[PDB]
Structures are given as structure tokens and as C-alpha cells.
């Protein structure tokens, strides 16, 4: 089709596909939710298939999965690692400990949610959020990344 609008819709569709297909995640590894993802990385529910990197340093990570309670001693760090991740970056909060305080909500040493520390994109629920459940959450991030229309907004801005 012929319209500067159509070219700018198709090209983000391209840019969005690249970010969607290759989401190199970074797992802090707090508490136990990290295990329920080490199961996602494992053979029953491979994540690599979907284009997910088992281990990625912050500077090369697209997604941060906060698994586990964010205590008031690890908070000052999470923010640092979130702040040092490359710009295109997304956060997935896994576990009722991270999205909200979960058991340990009322503790004096637990931040009641990572949303207080880092902006959160998808909240995956469950005490050990099941591994498919994380995989559904990562797939929901991919649906959110498809919908984003950054080039369209710059054109009509």
C-alpha cells in the first residue's frame, strides 16, 4: 500500500517483532520464584525456543524478572540494576512476594511489592507462580510489545 502512515506502521511492526522475538531476560534470583523459572529454562518448558536467554548480564538484558521477596536491603540494588539495564527494557514481577508483599507483606524488612522500586510491566501471580504461568506472563509481555507503536507516535507527533 502507499502512504507514509502504512510504511511507519509496517516498520515498527518490524521493530516490535525483533524486540518481541528476542527478549534477553535477566533474573535477579531472589527467594524461590527463581527456581520456578530455572524450570522454565529447563527442558519441559524451554524458554530459548521462544527466544529467551537463560542467563543475561544487565547491560545485555531486555527483561528483568524479579522473582522473590524484595527486602529493604536488596531494594537499593534492584533499582541500580534496573537503572543500568539498556534503555529498551521491561520488568516482569514474578511471585506474590514481588508483585505485592505476599506472605511477608507486613514484615519490617520486606518492600511491599517491587512496583514501589521498579516500574512493573506484567505481574505473574502465584506463591511459586507455575512455570507455565511465567511462560504465559512472558508471552503476555510479547503481546504488550507487539501493541507498542513508537514509530507511529513520532510520525503524528
Amino acid at each position: 500500500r502507499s502512504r507514509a502512515e502504512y510504511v511507519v506502521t509496517k516498520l515498527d511492526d518490524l521493530i516490535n517483532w525483533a524486540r518481541r522475538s528476542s527478549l534477553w531476560p535477566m533474573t535477579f534470583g531472589l527467594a524461590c520464584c527463581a527456581v520456578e523459572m530455572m524450570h522454565m529454562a529447563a527442558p519441559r518448558y524451554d524458554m530459548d525456543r521462544f527466544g529467551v536467554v537463560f542467563r543475561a548480564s544487565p547491560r545485555q538484558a531486555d527483561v528483568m524478572i524479579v522473582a522473590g521477596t524484595l527486602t529493604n536491603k536488596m531494594a537499593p540494588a534492584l533499582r541500580k540494576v534496573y537503572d543500568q539495564m539498556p534503555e529498551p527494557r521491561y520488568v516482569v514481577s514474578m511471585g506474590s512476594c514481588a508483585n505485592g508483599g505476599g506472605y511477608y507483606h507486613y514484615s519490617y524488612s520486606v518492600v511491599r511489592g517491587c512496583d514501589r522500586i521498579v516500574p512493573v510491566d506484567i505481574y505473574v501471580p502465584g506463591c511459586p507462580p507455575t512455570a507455565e504461568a511465567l511462560l504465559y506472563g512472558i508471552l503476555q509481555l510479547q503481546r504488550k510489545i507487539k501493541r507498542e507503536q513508537k514509530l507511529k507516535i513520532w510520525y503524528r507527533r
Binding site: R44, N99, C127, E132
Partner: protein, 178 residues
């Protein structure tokens, strides 16, 4: 009864044949080649992964998954606000306040499960006398915003109506056990 691991029972004195066998082990990396064979072997095994959207990892009837409030077949919600589901919740997640409905029946004006607070123990499933609050099978309820995770009576009742058919089958399968 104990067992020595890594304890050499005795000092086998080197015999040329033995020495050669060993020296060959160091020189021609024989054991290293052994390890490569194992991985080549699996390369030929069928991979165990499942297409996640198309195929799903099996969960049996007791899977706790996502909270739902059931209703009687007639259409009367099961909960009668005894509020011990609130009492036994370990995380303080369920908040219940009640008042006698116009019919005169006991019912909960507000039933709020904070799922981010909930640690999915499944005791609420256990505690309810009318078994109104059940651990529903669905585990896929990831939400973009934190507020969506907080659930009031209307979401849970709606969750109950959507999954009632499977919840009934699951409770049917496991009630003899309980």
C-alpha cells in the same frame, strides 16, 4: 551402615601395563572423549519440551491455581460469611465484611482476596464449611496492572461462574480423599 566414597582400599603398585593405560588416559584425553559420547547420545534422544500455548503441562485435580467463589446450582452464592476463611488465611489476604441481606439471609457485602498478598496455600479451600471458596484450576491470570490482581466479590463470583464446570469436576474427583 556407612559407605566410603573416594576411599582407595589399597595401593595398587604401578605395573607398566597399568602405567601405560594411565599415561594414555592423560595423553589422549580418553575420559574426556567418554564425556563427549554421552552428549552426542542425547542429541539423538527426543526432546522433552512441550509447545506451551498448544500443549499444556499436566496438572491433576488438587492444583490450587486461581481463587473462585462458587454458587449453588439454584443460583444462590455458596458463601454464608462465617468468615473463618479470613481467620485461617496465613497472609491476611481475604477481607470479608457482611450484613443480613434483604432476603434475611447471611451474605458477604464485600469479599476481597488480595492475590498479591495470597501465597496460594489452599487452606481457604480446606476451611470453608459450604466450600464456597475454592482453588480453581486456572494459573494463567497474569495482569498488566497491580490493581487488577486485587479481586473483589464480583471478579471471584465471575471467576467462579466461568470455571464452575471444571471446578465441579475437580471437587468431584477429590472429595472422597478429603
Amino acid at each position: 551402615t556407612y559407605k566410603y566414597v573416594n576411599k582407595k582400599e589399597q595401593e595398587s603398585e604401578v605395573d607398566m601395563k597399568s602405567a601405560t593405560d594411565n599415561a594414555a588416559r592423560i595423553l589422549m584425553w580418553t575420559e574426556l572423549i567418554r564425556g563427549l559420547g554421552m552428549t552426542l547420545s542425547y542429541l539423538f534422544r527426543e526432546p522433552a519440551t512441550i509447545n506451551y500455548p498448544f500443549e499444556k503441562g499436566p496438572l491433576s485435580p488438587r492444583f490450587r491455581g486461581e481463587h473462585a467463589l462458587r454458587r449453588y446450582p439454584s443460583g444462590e452464592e455458596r458463601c454464608i460469611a462465617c468468615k473463618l476463611c479470613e481467620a485461617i488465611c496465613p497472609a491476611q489476604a481475604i477481607t470479608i465484611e457482611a450484613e443480613p441481606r434483604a432476603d434475611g439471609s447471611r451474605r458477604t457485602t464485600r469479599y476481597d482476596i488480595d492475590m498479591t498478598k495470597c501465597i496460594y496455600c489452599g487452606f481457604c479451600q480446606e476451611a470453608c464449611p459450604v466450600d464456597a471458596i475454592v482453588e480453581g484450576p486456572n494459573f494463567e491470570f497474569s495482569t498488566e496492572t497491580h490493581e487488577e490482581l486485587l479481586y473483589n466479590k464480583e471478579k471471584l463470583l465471575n471467576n467462579g461462574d466461568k470455571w464452575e464446570a471444571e471446578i465441579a469436576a475437580n471437587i468431584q474427583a477429590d472429595y472422597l480423599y478429603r
